[PDB]
């Protein structure tokens, strides 16, 4: 009953879906590199809750060592891709 | 390859020996502390915290992923019971004293009530089931040459 694997376009569309359903600060228009603390004036609380929502969205868990350092959707996607070994 | 200088020795009673021993075991002096000297054989192998290996950072990609131990990181003298397929010192939200107290109290209560119920049992308000032929004195072996107590059963 295994579904198919994940690709970059799917990952990106999903991440944008979620960060747009977000309501605090995102002006519903996120650049793939829409830096949270710098380019959107976000808070550490918000960033951590984003990481947690992504963990719930993709089942697995993201360790703190990298949750604290992720500051870009492109970086989140690169991380997920190097963890699940996608795009043969 | 190995050599005496790289292998253990006797209890260093001088910082001169202690520091060399530490730089050999690949540690730092102020942290290095051997075992007491009761002549049981410990020698000079470091005394390390009595912690298990379920505690260690499980995320870091250790080289010995089954032991979460790095290459030269000194090895706890009692690893054989901390290999992680064995004793686990994983701390508990509940505490030792309280958990033991709970368990013993529960078990004592149970056994005490079981004795209580054996001393004051339940039973249906009737008598004992009857049996026609002297409690079938034959089918319980008995014998064909003995007339024991004639067990006659009456109506009410």
């Amino acid at each position: 009953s295994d579904a198919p694997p994940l690709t970059l376009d799917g990952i990106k569309d999903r991440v944008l879906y979620v960060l747009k359903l977000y309501d605090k600060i995102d002006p519903e228009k996120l650049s793939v590199n829409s830096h949270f603390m710098k380019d959107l004036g976000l808070d550490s609380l918000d960033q951590v809750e984003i990481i947690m929502a992504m963990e719930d969205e993709f089942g697995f868990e993201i360790p703190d060592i990298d949750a604290e350092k992720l500051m870009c959707p492109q970086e989140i996607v690169d991380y997920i891709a190097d963890k699940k070994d996608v795009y043969e | 390859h190995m050599t005496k200088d790289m292998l253990p020795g006797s209890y260093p009673r001088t910082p001169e020996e202690r520091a060399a021993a530490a730089k050999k075991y690949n540690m730092r002096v102020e942290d290095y502390e051997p075992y007491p000297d009761d002549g049981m054989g410990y020698g000079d192998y470091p005394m390390l915290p009595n912690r298990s290996q379920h505690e260690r950072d499980p995320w870091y990609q250790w080289d010995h992923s089954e032991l979460r131990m790095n290459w030269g990181e000194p090895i706890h003298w009692d690893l054989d019971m901390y290999i992680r397929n064995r004793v686990d010192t994983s701390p508990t939200p509940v505490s030792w004293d309280v958990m033991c107290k709970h368990l013993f109290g529960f078990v004592a209560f149970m056994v005490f009530m079981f004795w209580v119920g054996h001393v004051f049992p339940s039973y249906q308000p009737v008598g004992p089931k009857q049996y026609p032929y002297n409690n079938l004195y034959l089918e319980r072996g008995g014998d064909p040459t003995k007339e024991p107590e004639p067990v006659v059963h009456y109506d009410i």
Binding site: - | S65, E66, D80, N85
Partner: protein, 459 residues
């Protein structure tokens, strides 16, 4: 019997003169032919024991050991065919000659009647073992190990000989079954007690108790595969066979001359089985397991019950084979790595998919999984000991449990984890070693099938 010996005395010049490219195969196949011919002894139609001369004899208690030895010879050969590969042809020929001399001595002794011949052979067993252990080891303490071996054995040897003399003089002859048909009973004084001692002390020192188990681990560790094999299989069994054949005279002494030795054997079984949990060195673990089982053998030998003797023989044979097999497996995992340690190599069964099933099939035979001669023997011996007292099932059970534990600990720290990543030297299995495993196993199957051969005197 010469039909079994003479060819084993011809394999020697054969080895000496044969060419390098062919000596291995020639001697191996012909030793297998010897193993085959060694079955004539099994034509024991009726109860009349076999006697070939005043100098040789056979019996149901000896024949098994004879065949097992003639069949462990070639396995030693084969398991000794990848190391000493860069050692000269002359040296490997010496090694073969020593193995063959061991075979011949063991056969002659397990067959002989006169305990004095038995004794000279029991003590000539040494030279080849001491040599094999000193001149082909892989560590330095092999020297101290050989010294301990030799001197324990000779200390035992001496009073045994003195008592054999006292006997030969008081009694007229030393021949067995004459000792039987003309035995007698003793006034049971300190003299006869010390005689009982001087007769059993050597056989015990050899078949190790708790007190003198010390020379076993050193040997099985510092020494190579063949020495380990032969120790764990036979050179212990010699003590058991001697004790069985000799205790026939010392009745009744062995009723109260046993309590200390039974106590020591049981307690040692327990403590050594425990150490088998936390003993890093794999071969040391195996050696202490052997101690744990030979303690059962001894406790069953003393009290002199028929069930006990049959269980002793069963467990004896079973342990011999199983220990040879486990040692083959250890050596195998060593030649690829060169470190006995248990916790270094881990998480196999992903590259040696089959070998495991030669690891598994051993443990299950160690922890007494039935239907196996192992459990049959353990169980009959536990029965005899329960009859002899109701408070020994305790120790039997503690041992069974600790074994069921450490066997699986061994399985799981070498074939159940996750594979290392710096063991690039994992040359896959050799057909040769797979063959050795299969040959150590299959006979267990056939004997589990038909054990009437392997019972003992009482059956």
């Amino acid at each position: 019997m010469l039909k079994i010996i003479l060819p084993s005395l011809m394999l020697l010049p054969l080895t000496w003169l044969s060419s390098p490219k062919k000596t291995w195969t020639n001697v191996t196949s012909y030793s297998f032919l010897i193993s085959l011919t060694s079955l004539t002894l099994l034509w024991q139609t009726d109860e009349n024991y076999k006697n070939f001369s005043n100098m040789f004899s056979s019996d149901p208690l000896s024949t098994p050991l004879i065949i097992l030895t003639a069949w462990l010879l070639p396995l030693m050969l084969m398991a000794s065919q990848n190391h000493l590969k860069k050692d000269n042809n002359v040296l490997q020929k010496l090694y073969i000659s020593m193995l063959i001399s061991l075979q011949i001595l063991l056969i002659m002794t397990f067959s002989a009647t006169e305990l004095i011949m038995f004794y000279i052979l029991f003590e000539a067993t040494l030279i080849p073992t001491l040599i094999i252990i000193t001149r082909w080891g892989n560590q330095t303490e092999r020297l101290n190990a050989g010294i301990y071996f030799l001197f324990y054995t000779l200390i035992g040897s001496i009073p045994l000989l003195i008592a054999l003399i006292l006997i030969q003089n008081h009694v007229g002859t030393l021949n067995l079954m004459i000792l039987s048909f003309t035995t007698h009973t003793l006034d049971a004084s300190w003299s006869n007690n010390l005689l009982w001692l001087a007769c059993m002390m050597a056989f015990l020192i050899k078949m190790p108790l708790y007190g003198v188990h010390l020379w076993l681990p050193k040997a099985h560790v510092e020494a190579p595969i063949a020495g380990s094999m032969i120790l764990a299989a036979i050179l212990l069994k010699l003590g058991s066979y001697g004790m069985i054949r000799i205790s026939i005279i010392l009745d009744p002494l062995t009723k109260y001359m046993a309590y200390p030795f039974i106590l020591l054997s049981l307690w040692g079984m327990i403590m050594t089985s425990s150490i088998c949990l936390r003993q890093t060195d794999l071969k040391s673990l195996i050696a202490y397991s052997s101690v744990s089982h030979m303690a059962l053998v001894i406790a069953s030998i003393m009290i002199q019950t028929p069930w006990s003797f049959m269980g002793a023989t069963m467990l004896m044979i079973a342990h011999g084979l199983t220990s040879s097999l486990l040692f083959c497996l250890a050596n195998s995992n060593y030649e690829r790595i060169h470190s006995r340690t248990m916790i270094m190599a881990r998480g196999l069964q992903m590259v040696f998919p089959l070998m495991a099933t030669w690891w598994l099939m051993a443990s299950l035979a160690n922890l007494a999984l039935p239907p196996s001669i192992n459990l049959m023997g353990e169980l009959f011996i536990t029965m005899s000991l329960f009859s002899w007292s109701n408070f020994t099932i305790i120790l039997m059970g503690i041992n069974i449990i600790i074994t069921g534990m450490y066997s699986m600990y061994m399985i799981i720290t070498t074939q159940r984890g996750k594979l290392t990543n710096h063991m690039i030297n994992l040359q896959p299995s050799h057909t040769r070693e797979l063959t050795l495993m299969a040959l150590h196993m299959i006979p267990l199957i056939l004997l589990t099938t038909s054990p009437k051969l392997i019972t003992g005197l009482t059956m």
